[PDB]
Ligand SMILES: Nc1nc2c(ncn2[C@@H]2O[C@H](COP(=O)(O)OP(=O)(O)O)[C@@H](O)[C@H]2O)c(=O)[nH]1
């Protein structure tokens with residue numbers, strides 16, 4: 076469907092623009108160049124890859140074009156790896172902020188620049204390990220020896236429900252939920268030391284982080300559980316699939332905003348960049 | 359390792375607070391190293407050492423609550439520390455010391471604080487104030503009056519980059535310092551996320 080393709084392409088553009096802008100801001104601004112933002116830049120890097128590589132590959136999987144089954148599995152697996160890294164790099168930010176709020180003194184002694192690279196590498200090795208698991212044999216595998224290249228044709232739903240949804244969406248969501256509720260509690264404690272309007276604002280801001288992650292990722296994976304556990308049910312309609320797939324990719328558009336745009340230092344840097352680009356054409 | 363700046367008047371017990379914990383003093387709490395430096399009074403030794411460092415996590419300020427006259431001196435010194443160009447964003451852990459001796463002074467009745475601080479006559483104990491079991495409301499009132507005398511200064515320049523954490527000290531001072539540093543830097547992270 077044309078609507079799916081173009082909406083999907085819009086998001087890819089918006090994903091590249093917003094995340095390059097985040098990355099560019101860290102390169103220019105000297106104050107943004109510190110260990111805590113390694114996690115933001117890794118996230119932003121992953122989201123660019125989602126826009127450039129993962130979404131175009133996801134578009135191809137929608138067409139059911141003719142290809143060798145194991146070629147089709149490789150493309151589907153590549154979409155999984157890149158989206159997984161986006162989710163795991165997102166989790167890394169929450170683990171960082173958890174250490175920061177729970178163990179605030181040792182933070183600088185625990186969270187070193189080298190150890191942060193360790194964490195980021197683990198995020199990407201876990202992405203490959205999990206997203207390429209179907210290539211190792213756990214799969215459902217035009218001229219002879221070719222098939223219609225579709226996602227649910229090559230990637231088994233037991234993998235998606237028992238391993239992928241559990242490991243890559245549900246656990247992260249639960250961890251993030253738990254982490255941000257503990258950070259909120261610390262904020263409300265310190266607010267009391269120094270207006271419940273300020274507490275409500277804080278609660279709202281952390282609700283938005285976890286709420287958006289759940290809004291983006293749960294629809295498609297909830298639907299996948301429905302598909303897996305009810306093989307007798309008529310399958311979810313194709314417009315709903317396109318909606319849910321699109322929603323999952325739209326995490327990469329809002330991930331810039333909520334994370335980076337919640338830092339004043341990023342916000343001011345964005346002004347100076349857009350302004351100095353317009354001052355540049357109008358001389 | 360967490361750097362601290364210890365300062366306060368002569369006979370403010372600033373030397374005993376560091377004695378119990380054992381000029382340069384490094385102590386261990388909850389497997390977190392601290393490194394304190396003694397540099398105070400306002401007489402001398404302060405302006406030399408203060409302008410070296412920079413990365414002090416917090417300033418420990420000790421005042422004798424019992425010494426009503428030198429309390430005015432201490433208030434001046436505090437105002438100075440609070441508005442100092444080099445220490446503008448540095449948070450102050452405030453020890454109101456010799457509480458026991460204050461209790462004695464106040465219960466005795468010889469010296470009336472209103473003499474040194476007339477606006478005390480129209481001061482009533484705060485509703486939030488949490489006096490301990492067996493504390494004469496008079497002693498509580500005076501104690502909290504001094505505390506508030508130091509706090510009005512903190513709130514005068516109400517920028518909110520830094521804060522003043524008070525204590526009543528007569529046992530466990532190391533833990534108070536620990537907790538206050540923990541709070542300071544945890545609030546630095548909370549501020550960093552605009553969660554403040
Ligand atoms: N009762 C009581 N006496 C204190 C306290 N702190 C200090 N002192 C007394 O004050 C005197 C001077 O204290 P010191 O620590 O040397 O003052 P500094 O040199 O200004 O720090 C000592 O001889 C102590 O007996 C306290 O918390 N309670």
Ligand SMILES: CCNC(=O)[C@H]1O[C@@H](n2cnc3c(N)ncnc32)[C@H](O)[C@@H]1O
Nearest residue numbers: 133154155158159226227243320323324
């Ligand atoms: C780690 C989780 N990754 C995904 O859900 C991505 O994988 C793809 N995906 C997952 N399940 C399906 C499905 N049932 N049909 C099509 N694509 C899917 C989508 O492009 C998602 O963005």
Ligand SMILES: CCCCCCCCS[C@@H]1O[C@H](CO)[C@@H](O)[C@H](O)[C@H]1O
Nearest residue numbers: 188189190191192193194195196197
């Ligand atoms: C203080 C002494 C440190 C010596 C080096 C420790 C060994 C791990 S190096 C670390 O390994 C990661 C893999 O997890 C890579 O991603 C990083 O690039 C790299 O930095």
Ligand SMILES: CCCCCCCCS[C@@H]1O[C@H](CO)[C@@H](O)[C@H](O)[C@H]1O
Nearest residue numbers: 093096331332335336342343345346
């Ligand atoms: C982080 C993901 C989003 C990247 C796109 C940035 C668009 C913001 S433009 C700019 O934003 C400033 C704060 O940054 C505001 O003060 C101004 O109203 C406005 O001129």
